[model samples]
Target: AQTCLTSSQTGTNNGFYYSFWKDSPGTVNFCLQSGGRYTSNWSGINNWVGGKGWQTGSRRNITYSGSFNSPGNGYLALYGWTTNPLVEYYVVDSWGSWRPPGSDGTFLGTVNSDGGTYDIYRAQRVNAPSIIGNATFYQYWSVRQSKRVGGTITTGNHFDAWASVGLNLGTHNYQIMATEGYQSSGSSDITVSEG
Candidate 1:
């Protein structure tokens, strides 16, 4: 079963979204927002370092499906710890600066993977507000793949396939799904799936 939380109700869940893994390493949060009335900018921060239940197979893929209107956008995030790297596999209905937020890591150019190219980054988001201890992460940010009311999308894998190019194949410590709306006049309906 899937539970829906609008921008007005997404906040305050400082822990897991629909499931519980661990509270220390970090939290897996799902943030959904409707444009306009909802705040325009925000990133889902995973405040976990790494260890214990914070791991996944290298063959996993973080997938997503949705639509965006102007000041609105949504995407999936994987914060690698054990200081692993992050990858965005795909962005559904994305564009402009309304895409994913940036981190304090270094951008190591772009790599070709499923769908299109991805910009990779490395950083330890320990000092990030929501995360706990300190740990490094590999982030994958998808390009400007977006959709609107009159359209639909089917995404390709955003991870694993890129492993040969320097993408990490280890287990990630944190994960998040977020949606943001700016200055109103925007709306979105997105669905995220496990890897």
Candidate 2:
């Protein structure tokens, strides 16, 4: 099933699924579930920084399946943030609650998707962004730690996810996937569907 969503839509509070498309190099999807606790933001953009040339129009259907043992502390996400002069891609393993980041599983060491070697990790996000559209929820950092570029994240889960090196002048302006987990329960797994 496919869903279409817009910025002007409302009442999208906590339990729903949505998607949308943008022109001139922007793309996407958005979903919220688990009593409205988890939010899924999906997109297809082609301006990577951490590595080399990024393949355009490429999409990955990642299906995250598993449990977020603790209630109210589960997330399945992938997004980006551009803090001027740099951008960071977040492959959120788990957030909220007392669960460790990579405690459940591990990530592929190196994937040449964004740019340089994208070392997979289970870390916390120190200065994590709040609210994707109108979906607001709890946040945490590392158990899965990746290399951060050009930023001094002294502590927290900021570098707790993935990395996007190089330079840019914006902040959290991209969507990868949304709400794959709704307060997970047990034995979680992320399956990537062929594009």
Candidate 3:
């Protein structure tokens, strides 16, 4: 059986922390399947995020396999946040139609990891909503040049890469293999695991 959620929610299940959030109005459904597995479908949503992973993110090797279907713009990535510096980060492995951190972001160069090369970008969110309420924060992005559905992501490698570029993070926070939708419609089935 699946637990379907419509409003923002969070909890621990099957040994993993899961969460769902929508900042705008529209129809979105997030379902927890089991353990590190989940599914989501949405239409006409302004923005939404949902997935499953650790309550306190750290340097760990994470693996994920999934199918993502979206017609507008969004990301299927390793997403999380941090305190001390109040930062949000994304290790985007796949995306819908538009590549994120679009034109307004600063290109901080590239990193090669996990059998792929990733382009790094730093963007700022001014007084935006976050895991700890509305506050200004930096968003670190490592978008894979080539998109794929499943692979092992060594979180430490990307973290080190960000540090090399002066994009250091803060204290660990909740991390998850996430699916996001922004003014888009899509569906995803994802399973994540850490070792």
Candidate 4:
């Protein structure tokens, strides 16, 4: 269902499953059972960097080719976990967490993002805003209900798990933010590109 770029030289050693779209025919799935630890040193802004890479994250370029499947504009999904039981998954924006106080910056308003980064913007303001919301229950990176992957990844697992796909909302171009690079804890310079 989804196209992917993996840093794991082992090639799909981890227990990660993928599906370009849910209920998709012969969709997608894989394993994170084994892979290189994510490069936490990578950095960039709109320049695809490696964040909790294979460790606690997986970037899927859901839209690009014609025959390949599309995960919608911001229909991307990530499966990971957190350390603090109280902390929840949240989509980080140009500002930070879409919340307040300890809140990062954005909320649910309008802004220029070249389109939808994590389903934050609207292609025409019709599709749902891709959510980076946290997972209520923490799961592992390679294993289901495994362990804490990153500090607290954006786990919107329970169905509301649609995050922006690749490129702008309607187009299918590999994004750089979602590619491979690195970012600070506040991962702002983030975009999704091809493998």
Best by TM-score: 3
Per-residue accuracy of model 2 over 1-195 as CA lDDT, tens digit each: 323342322233223222222222323233334432232332343211111011221223333343323244444344433333233345444444433344532443433333223335433344433334322222222222333212111111234233322112244333333222222232122222222
**TM-scores vs. true structure, each candidate:** 0.43, 0.25, 0.98, 0.22
Better of 3 and 4 by lDDT: 3
Which prediction has more favorable lDDT, 1 or 4? 1
Which sections of candidate 3 miss by over 4 Å? none
Q: Residues 1-195, candidate 4, lDDT per residue (tens digit)?
A: 222432322222233222111211221122122232121111222212222133333333221210111121111123222343321222332222211112222223322221333323212212221222323332111111111112223223211332232111121211111211112122111212223
Best by lDDT: 3
TM-score of candidate 2 against the unseen true structure: 0.25
TM-score: the better of candidates 3 and 4: 3
Order of candidates by lDDT, top first?
3, 1, 2, 4
Candidate 4, overall lDDT? Answer: 0.22
Alpha carbon lDDT of residue 43, candidate 1?
30
Clashes of each: 22, 46, 0, 43
Each prediction's Cα lDDT score? 0.34, 0.31, 0.92, 0.22
lDDT (tens digit, per residue) of candidate 3 on 137-166: 899999999888899999999999999999
